[PDB]
Amino acid sequence: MTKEKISVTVDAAVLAAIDADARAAGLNRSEMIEQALRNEHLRVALRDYT
Amino acid sequence: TKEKISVTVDAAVLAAIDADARAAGLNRSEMIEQALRNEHLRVALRDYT
Amino acid sequence: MTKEKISVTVDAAVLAAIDADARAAGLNRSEMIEQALRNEHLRVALRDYT
Amino acid sequence: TKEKISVTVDAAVLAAIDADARAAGLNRSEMIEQALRNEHLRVALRDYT
Amino acid sequence: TKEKISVTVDAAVLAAIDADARAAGLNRSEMIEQALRNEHLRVALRDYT
Amino acid sequence: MTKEKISVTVDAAVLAAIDADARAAGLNRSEMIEQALRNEHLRVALRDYT
Amino acid sequence: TKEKISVTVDAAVLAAIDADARAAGLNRSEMIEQALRNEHLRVALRDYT
Amino acid sequence: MTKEKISVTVDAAVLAAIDADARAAGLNRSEMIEQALRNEHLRVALRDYT
């Protein structure tokens, strides 16, 4: 299960909110971002491929 | 206003998100922002009670 | 609704079978291949992103 | 035994399949073959009766 | 020109005909048409006289 | 001896001819189609598996 | 032609299948037959090898 | 984790096929039927609720 290190630019309020959610969930930032991306991919797949 | 950050993410998930971004006419940063804004809502979904 | 023309190499028996399914469905080859690809993407999303 | 063919497919679907192929360690032709083999089974799924 | 019909046939025979169709690059309806056209000839085979 | 009910599309002249054969043989349509399919499977087996 | 059998199945799955049957105008046995016929196709789905 | 014992009537050829799949998968009959029912519920949900 390999990983890539990437640089991204994100709205400061969006970032602060998901950082607060990461803390509540006991996740670090990269772990909560991965979770968000996995769920968003599923959102898009269910919307566009059903 | 916008912050540049460095994160480490699963390579397969990143390739999938890059393809979803292309379909949407977005770049990677925009698609990641879409995901993070929606995830703040999804983590609040609950079972009763 | 943009499309791309591509060249692909496919097993002849696999191709003949899905061409027969396309004929039964009233689809041309490209339409049936598109259907197969959409459904396969959903297969992979449900397997790996749930 | 293998046939080279030309087909025209939705660009968003192709990008999604390319990313699924990368995740699987496959090239485009192999992932397309996976999809076509499986679709021959899926079209036979039915409701009763 | 072509007629859509419902028929009830032995399940083992149907599975065999489906596999013969696949081998021939045909779908079920085409293989059934092959069989029905040929059976019109076979029923006319005779012993002397 | 289980059976399956199926929908198929057949050339009208081919169907009319085998219906006329069914009547001559005292068979209903499904019985004559089953006979045709059994004999065709044997045709293919003798051609391809001997 | 049809066999009567006794099986033990998760109660939540059974309730879900009962509701799907009602939606389809089927009884439990018919919806279970739909599922078993389709599952014989699904277990044959594969990744490229 | 609770289970229910039920009686059902199933086409003999359908049953024989899924019994053969159960053997190939190392499952008993009830385990393979449960798998079939879970996957069929998902089939119906994705078809009707997306």
Side-chain angles (χ1 to χ4, degrees):
Chain A
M1 294 184 67
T2 71
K3 297 216 189 287
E4 248 182 79
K5 192 153 151 122
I6 60 168
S7 178
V8 286
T9 305
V10 55
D11 180 89
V14 169
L15 186 57
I18 203 72
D19 280 342
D21 291 322
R23 296 196 300 277
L27 295 184
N28 63 36
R29 180 184 283 171
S30 285
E31 288 165 337
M32 175 57 81
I33 289 177
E34 194 171 300
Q35 172 177 306
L37 296 184
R38 260 184 110 249
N39 292 338
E40 194 60 25
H41 182 59
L42 182 70
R43 172 174 179 263
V44 166
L46 291 169
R47 189 187 62 214
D48 296 342
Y49 290 83
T50 51
Chain B
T1 288
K2 296 235 193 209
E3 183 174 347
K4 193 161 117 193
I5 61 170
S6 169
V7 299
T8 300
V9 295
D10 184 76
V13 172
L14 183 66
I17 282 297
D18 282 336
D20 294 330
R22 189 179 188 277
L26 302 182
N27 58 46
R28 181 183 286 176
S29 289
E30 293 161 341
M31 170 55 62
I32 288 174
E33 184 176 316
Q34 176 176 305
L36 302 179
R37 171 177 285 288
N38 284 337
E39 186 67 14
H40 178 69
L41 293 164
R42 286 185 290 257
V43 299
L45 296 166
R46 288 290 182 276
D47 290 351
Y48 185 98
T49 66
Chain C
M1 287 187 56
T2 310
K3 300 218 188 289
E4 240 182 271
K5 194 136 195 72
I6 57 172
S7 175
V8 56
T9 303
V10 53
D11 179 273
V14 171
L15 184 59
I18 202 71
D19 280 340
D21 293 321
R23 295 194 302 272
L27 295 183
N28 65 40
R29 181 182 282 172
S30 287
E31 291 165 337
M32 176 56 80
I33 288 175
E34 191 169 304
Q35 173 179 306
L37 295 184
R38 282 189 85 247
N39 295 338
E40 192 64 20
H41 182 62
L42 181 72
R43 171 173 182 264
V44 165
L46 292 168
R47 188 186 63 211
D48 297 339
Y49 291 83
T50 47
Chain D
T1 44
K2 293 231 198 228
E3 185 169 346
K4 193 168 118 189
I5 62 167
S6 169
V7 294
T8 300
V9 55
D10 186 77
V13 172
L14 183 66
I17 282 301
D18 284 334
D20 295 331
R22 195 187 185 274
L26 305 182
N27 58 45
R28 182 182 287 175
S29 289
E30 294 162 341
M31 172 57 64
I32 290 177
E33 183 178 319
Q34 178 176 303
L36 303 181
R37 186 168 313 257
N38 285 336
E39 189 65 13
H40 176 68
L41 292 164
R42 287 185 287 256
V43 298
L45 296 165
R46 289 286 182 276
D47 291 351
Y48 184 97
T49 181
Chain E
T1 272
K2 296 242 179 191
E3 188 167 339
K4 189 167 144 197
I5 64 172
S6 289
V7 298
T8 299
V9 295
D10 186 77
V13 171
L14 184 64
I17 280 305
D18 281 336
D20 295 331
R22 197 187 182 273
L26 303 180
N27 59 44
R28 182 181 286 176
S29 291
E30 291 162 343
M31 174 55 67
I32 292 176
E33 186 176 315
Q34 175 176 305
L36 302 181
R37 173 178 283 290
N38 282 339
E39 186 69 11
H40 179 64
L41 292 164
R42 286 185 289 256
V43 295
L45 295 166
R46 288 288 184 276
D47 290 349
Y48 184 96
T49 62
Chain F
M1 274 282 180
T2 305
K3 294 208 190 300
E4 223 181 285
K5 177 119 72 166
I6 57 167
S7 174
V8 287
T9 301
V10 55
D11 181 276
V14 171
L15 185 60
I18 202 72
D19 279 340
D21 293 321
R23 296 196 299 278
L27 297 183
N28 62 37
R29 181 181 286 170
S30 291
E31 287 165 339
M32 176 55 81
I33 287 175
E34 192 173 301
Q35 172 177 309
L37 293 184
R38 295 201 89 102
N39 293 336
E40 191 66 21
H41 183 60
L42 183 70
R43 172 173 179 261
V44 166
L46 292 169
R47 189 188 61 214
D48 297 340
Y49 291 83
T50 46
Chain G
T1 168
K2 301 235 183 197
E3 194 194 332
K4 193 192 198 177
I5 65 176
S6 171
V7 296
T8 298
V9 295
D10 184 77
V13 174
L14 182 66
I17 281 300
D18 281 336
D20 295 330
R22 197 190 183 270
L26 303 182
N27 58 44
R28 182 183 285 177
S29 286
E30 293 162 342
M31 171 56 64
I32 289 172
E33 185 179 316
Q34 177 175 305
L36 302 180
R37 175 180 282 290
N38 283 337
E39 187 67 13
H40 177 69
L41 291 163
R42 287 186 287 257
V43 297
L45 298 163
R46 286 293 180 274
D47 288 354
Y48 181 86
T49 59
Chain H
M1 277 283 282
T2 310
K3 298 210 188 296
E4 228 181 282
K5 185 123 64 176
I6 62 171
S7 175
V8 291
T9 306
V10 53
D11 179 273
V14 170
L15 184 59
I18 203 73
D19 279 342
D21 291 322
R23 296 195 301 274
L27 300 182
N28 66 31
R29 178 184 283 172
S30 287
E31 289 166 335
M32 175 57 80
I33 289 179
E34 193 172 298
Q35 173 176 307
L37 295 184
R38 284 191 82 245
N39 292 339
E40 191 64 22
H41 184 59
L42 182 69
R43 173 172 179 266
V44 171
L46 292 170
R47 187 187 64 212
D48 295 340
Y49 290 84
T50 49

